[PDB]
Design an enzyme around this catalytic site. Structure first.
Site, PDB file in Angstrom:
ATOM      1  N   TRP A 136       0.815  -1.208   0.000  1.00  0.00           N
ATOM      2  CA  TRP A 136       0.000   0.000   0.000  1.00  0.00           C
ATOM      3  C   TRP A 136       0.854   1.266   0.000  1.00  0.00           C
ATOM      4  O   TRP A 136       0.353   2.343   0.345  1.00  0.00           O
ATOM      5  CB  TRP A 136      -0.944  -0.029   1.206  1.00  0.00           C
ATOM      6  CG  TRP A 136      -1.964  -1.137   1.070  1.00  0.00           C
ATOM      7  CD1 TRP A 136      -3.232  -1.029   0.600  1.00  0.00           C
ATOM      8  CD2 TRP A 136      -1.774  -2.530   1.404  1.00  0.00           C
ATOM      9  NE1 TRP A 136      -3.846  -2.261   0.607  1.00  0.00           N
ATOM     10  CE2 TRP A 136      -2.976  -3.198   1.101  1.00  0.00           C
ATOM     11  CE3 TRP A 136      -0.699  -3.276   1.926  1.00  0.00           C
ATOM     12  CZ2 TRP A 136      -3.142  -4.583   1.305  1.00  0.00           C
ATOM     13  CZ3 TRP A 136      -0.864  -4.648   2.129  1.00  0.00           C
ATOM     14  CH2 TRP A 136      -2.076  -5.284   1.818  1.00  0.00           C
ATOM     15  N   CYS A 181      -6.608  -5.229  -1.732  1.00  0.00           N
ATOM     16  CA  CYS A 181      -7.868  -5.924  -1.457  1.00  0.00           C
ATOM     17  C   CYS A 181      -8.506  -6.548  -2.707  1.00  0.00           C
ATOM     18  O   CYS A 181      -8.663  -7.772  -2.785  1.00  0.00           O
ATOM     19  CB  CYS A 181      -8.839  -4.962  -0.724  1.00  0.00           C
ATOM     20  SG  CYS A 181      -9.619  -3.725  -1.637  1.00  0.00           S
ATOM     21  N   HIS A 199     -13.551  -2.209   1.360  1.00  0.00           N
ATOM     22  CA  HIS A 199     -12.761  -3.432   1.354  1.00  0.00           C
ATOM     23  C   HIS A 199     -13.489  -4.487   0.534  1.00  0.00           C
ATOM     24  O   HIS A 199     -14.712  -4.449   0.385  1.00  0.00           O
ATOM     25  CB  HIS A 199     -12.489  -3.936   2.779  1.00  0.00           C
ATOM     26  CG  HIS A 199     -11.658  -5.183   2.854  1.00  0.00           C
ATOM     27  ND1 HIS A 199     -10.624  -5.449   1.982  1.00  0.00           N
ATOM     28  CD2 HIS A 199     -11.662  -6.201   3.750  1.00  0.00           C
ATOM     29  CE1 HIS A 199     -10.060  -6.600   2.309  1.00  0.00           C
ATOM     30  NE2 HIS A 199     -10.670  -7.074   3.381  1.00  0.00           N
ATOM     31  N   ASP A 207     -11.722 -14.449   2.989  1.00  0.00           N
ATOM     32  CA  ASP A 207     -10.885 -13.287   2.673  1.00  0.00           C
ATOM     33  C   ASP A 207      -9.415 -13.675   2.611  1.00  0.00           C
ATOM     34  O   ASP A 207      -8.870 -14.218   3.584  1.00  0.00           O
ATOM     35  CB  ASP A 207     -11.077 -12.184   3.721  1.00  0.00           C
ATOM     36  CG  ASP A 207     -10.497 -10.825   3.293  1.00  0.00           C
ATOM     37  OD1 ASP A 207      -9.882 -10.695   2.186  1.00  0.00           O
ATOM     38  OD2 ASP A 207     -10.727  -9.868   4.068  1.00  0.00           O
ATOM     39  N   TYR A 224     -33.027 -28.963   3.691  1.00  0.00           N
ATOM     40  CA  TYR A 224     -32.626 -30.001   4.634  1.00  0.00           C
ATOM     41  C   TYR A 224     -31.107 -30.169   4.716  1.00  0.00           C
ATOM     42  O   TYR A 224     -30.611 -30.613   5.756  1.00  0.00           O
ATOM     43  CB  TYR A 224     -33.273 -31.332   4.291  1.00  0.00           C
ATOM     44  CG  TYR A 224     -32.607 -31.990   3.141  1.00  0.00           C
ATOM     45  CD1 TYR A 224     -31.777 -33.089   3.323  1.00  0.00           C
ATOM     46  CD2 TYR A 224     -32.793 -31.499   1.858  1.00  0.00           C
ATOM     47  CE1 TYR A 224     -31.165 -33.694   2.242  1.00  0.00           C
ATOM     48  CE2 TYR A 224     -32.190 -32.089   0.775  1.00  0.00           C
ATOM     49  CZ  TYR A 224     -31.378 -33.184   0.964  1.00  0.00           C
ATOM     50  OH  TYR A 224     -30.781 -33.751  -0.140  1.00  0.00           O
TER      51      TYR A 224
END
Ligand SMILES: [Ca+2]
Ligand SMILES: [Ca+2]
Ligand SMILES: [Ca+2]
Lengths: 688, 7
Positions: free
Chosen positions: A265, A300, A354, A377, A523
């Site tokens: 980042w 991300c 995000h 994630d 079910y």
């Protein structure tokens, strides 16, 4: 020793002699294979019917729990009086039958539900065509194929032949599969769509990034198998989509596990591709496969795009969701700790948005009702049991704050609905924001590029009392009142009572604020719909029990039932004076009234037969104006018989004369409705 | 993806 690599193989003997075989055996007495055909062209029946025709791959690809055709040519015609053979599928260097990695396929008369077997469906000259059926719980991967002919001296086996190697994938089209998805349009978008759309921007300025998933491109399927090899994932668990998706969330990021993608980042992205330059997943995965080292760089959405490819490629239905104002909880306390702003003490943070993935599966490890979409994630944020990975967390468990069920649900909850807690440390709590986190959660719409608001699957609406109660529950899963509920004798087609019981054993008068959520569940445990939601208040006098019966009317659930559907109930109550929270969830099967249909007389499509419909009053009450309908397109024009009353637990019979006018395997259907019990059915197959 | 400042 561990068997954790699809790429590794063992060497299966071609002449597996047993004992001290005398010299001069004549093995010519026995069948040998002259060729195997898999009909594996991408225009042909196997790949088209198995929805694998799109992979850029020359080998057979099939989906588990569904039959496919092959053909074996022998040296002489197969004769079951003297000959005995079996097909084998093998994976890994250490295959084991009790571990699902050596799979002997017997030749059987009739295929059986959910079991490996092969049925001869055609014979001609020296060849036999087989319909092979695999287990719906089969391991996902690339299998080696052999034919083994049994002799009194041992097995005679075909030699290694990579042209018949066979991929077996997850099967969203197979109802016995953990990843069954009963909606064709949903299967098209979440499995077979290899492009998509990822949402970003801000709540009010929402941007769209297109993404090429490319799950069918040359090399990609092989790369995903290689990802699992690199994780050293035991092969015997690769049939379990929980394990496959949890391994995926660890392996797609490079932290901890030498995975695919390095996150960055830092606005510089030295010696790599900057996250915004990627436009798809293929160049990332293929470079990982070739270099066998992490790729630089992602954030991300790139993590989620590559993870989406992995899931869809293997057959696990998958989508990418975007959370606007996504919280990052650094201390696992499920709230944003904002110290007053003191940037050195304050460790938590909020993202403008995000991205992460949802994967569709049943949750046989969770109570009934928590299957369906699971948040997973691969963006590294927090350790889950010592590794950077996250999920599967049941979105349904998150919504009601039952974050006790694995995996990583408290974290995902904090991402979508944590409060902001403004704190002043000194030699003190100053403000609380309960609407900031997770203002909107979206995913690509089906059959188009627009948004689908899916916020309501993750959380109740802000300001609603249920939102508060689920969060207080969430915080409790990390005062002398007992709470319990039982569903009072519930019969399909009739109303019924949900009796919530509080027992106050203290000398105090308490006030209770509570909500209840009633749901239809398949079910297999996948949720279908909430059909009733109530919030209610009650006072609890000291030293007293107190029942609060909730009427659930037939019209509230009858419009949404499915075969073998069960009911799933959430009740959560706060003792207001104590702030204590009591939370319970329970599932229950509806009692299903019967209608038996018999046929007296011959069922030839020319004369008359008699259809006996039988109904038994399942209730302790008196049914009235009981209409009974019979339907049967080939056997009878539609007909009705009325009964003014059926006394309690009494039985009525209805004989209908019919002249069938078509031959074949037709069907009769019966229905009953009364003033109270209604829309109970019976059916019977009949040949003509 | 950006970190947003606490309001
Ligand atoms: Ca990792
Ligand atoms: Ca925190
Ligand atoms: Ca909130």
């Amino acid at each position: 020793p561990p068997n954790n690599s699809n790429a590794a193989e063992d060497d299966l003997p071609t002449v597996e002699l047993q004992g001290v075989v005398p010299r001069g055996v004549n093995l010519q007495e026995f069948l040998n294979v002259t060729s195997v055909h898999l009909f594996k062209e991408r225009w042909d029946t196997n790949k088209v019917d198995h929805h694998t025709d799109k992979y850029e791959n020359n080998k057979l690809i099939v989906r588990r729990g569904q039959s496919f055709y092959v053909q074996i040519d022998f040296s002489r015609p197969y004769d079951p009086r003297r000959d005995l053979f079996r097909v084998e599928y093998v994976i890994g260097r250490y295959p084991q039958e009790n571990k699902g990695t050596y799979i002997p396929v017997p030749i059987v008369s009739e295929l059986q539900s959910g079991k490996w077997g092969a049925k001869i469906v055609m014979r001609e000259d020296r060849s036999v065509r087989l319909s092979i059926q695999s287990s719906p719980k089969c391991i996902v991967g690339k299998f080696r194929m052999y034919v083994a002919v049994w002799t009194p001296y041992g097995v005679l086996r075909t030699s290694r032949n990579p042209e018949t190697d066979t991929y077996i994938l997850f099967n969203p089209w197979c109802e016995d599969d953990a990843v069954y998805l009963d909606n064709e349009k949903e299967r098209e978008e979440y499995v077979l769509n290899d492009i998509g759309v990822i949402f970003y921007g801000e709540v009010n300025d929402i941007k769209t990034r297109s993404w090429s998933y490319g799950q069918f491109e040359d090399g990609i399927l092989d790369t995903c198998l290689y990802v699992m090899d690199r994780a050293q994932m035991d092969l015997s668990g690769r049939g379990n989509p929980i394990k496959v998706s949890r391994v995926g969330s660890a392996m797609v990021n490079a932290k901890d596990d030498e995975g695919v993608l390095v996150g960055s980042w830092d606005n510089i992205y030295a010696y790599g591709v900057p996250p915004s330059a990627w436009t798809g997943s293929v160049d990332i995965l293929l470079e990982y496969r070739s270099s066998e080292n992490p790729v630089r760089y992602g954030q991300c959405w790139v993590f989620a795009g590559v993870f989406n490819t992995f899931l869809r490629c293997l057959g696990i239905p998958a989508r990418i969701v975007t959370n606007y104002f996504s919280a990052h909880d650094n201390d696992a306390n499920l709230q944003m700790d904002i110290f007053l702003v003191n940037s050195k003490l304050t460790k938590d943070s909020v993202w403008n948005y995000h991205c992460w993935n949802e994967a569709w599966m049943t949750r046989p490890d969770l109570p009934v009702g928590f299957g369906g979409w699971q948040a997973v994630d691969s963006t590294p944020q927090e350790n889950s049991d010592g590794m950077y990975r996250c999920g599967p967390a049941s979105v349904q468990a998150i919504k009601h704050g039952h974050v006790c069920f694995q995996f990583d649900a408290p974290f995902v909850f904090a991402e979508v609905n944590s409060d902001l807690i403004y704190i002043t440390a000194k030699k003190v709590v100053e403000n609380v924001d309960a609407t900031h986190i997770g203002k909107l959660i979206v995913t690509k719409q089906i059959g188009g590029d627009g948004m689908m608001d899916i916020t309501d699957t993750y959380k109740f609406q802000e300001g609603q009392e249920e939102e508060r109660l689920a969060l207080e529950t969430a915080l409790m899963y990390g005062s002398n009142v007992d709470m319990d509920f039982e569903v009072e004798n519930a019969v399909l087609g009739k109303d019924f009572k949900l009796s919530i019981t509080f027992r106050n054993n203290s000398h105090n008068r308490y006030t209770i604020t509570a909500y209840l959520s009633a749901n239809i569940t398949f079910y297999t445990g996948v949720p279908k719909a909430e059909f009733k939601k109530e919030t209610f208040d009650v006072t609890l006098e000291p030293l007293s029990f107190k029942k609060e019966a909730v009427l659930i009317q037939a019209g509230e659930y009858m419009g949404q039932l499915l075969e073998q559907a069960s009911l799933h109930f959430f009740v959560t109550a706060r003792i207001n004076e104590t702030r204590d929270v009591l939370a319970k969830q329970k599932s229950t099967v509806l009692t299903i009234p019967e209608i038996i249909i018999k046929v007296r007389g011959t069922q030839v499509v020319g004369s008359d037969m008699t259809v006996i419909v039988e109904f038994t009053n399942p209730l302790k009450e008196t049914l009235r104006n009981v209409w009974v309908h019979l339907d049967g397109p080939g056997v009878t024009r539609p007909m009705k018989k009325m009964f003014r009353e059926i006394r309690p637990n009494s039985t009525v019979q209805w004989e209908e004369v019919c002249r069938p006018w078509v031959s074949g395997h037709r069907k009769l259907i019966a229905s009953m409705s009364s003033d109270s019990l209604r829309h109970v059915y019976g059916e019977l197959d009949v040949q003509i | 993806x950006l970190i947003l400042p606490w309001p």
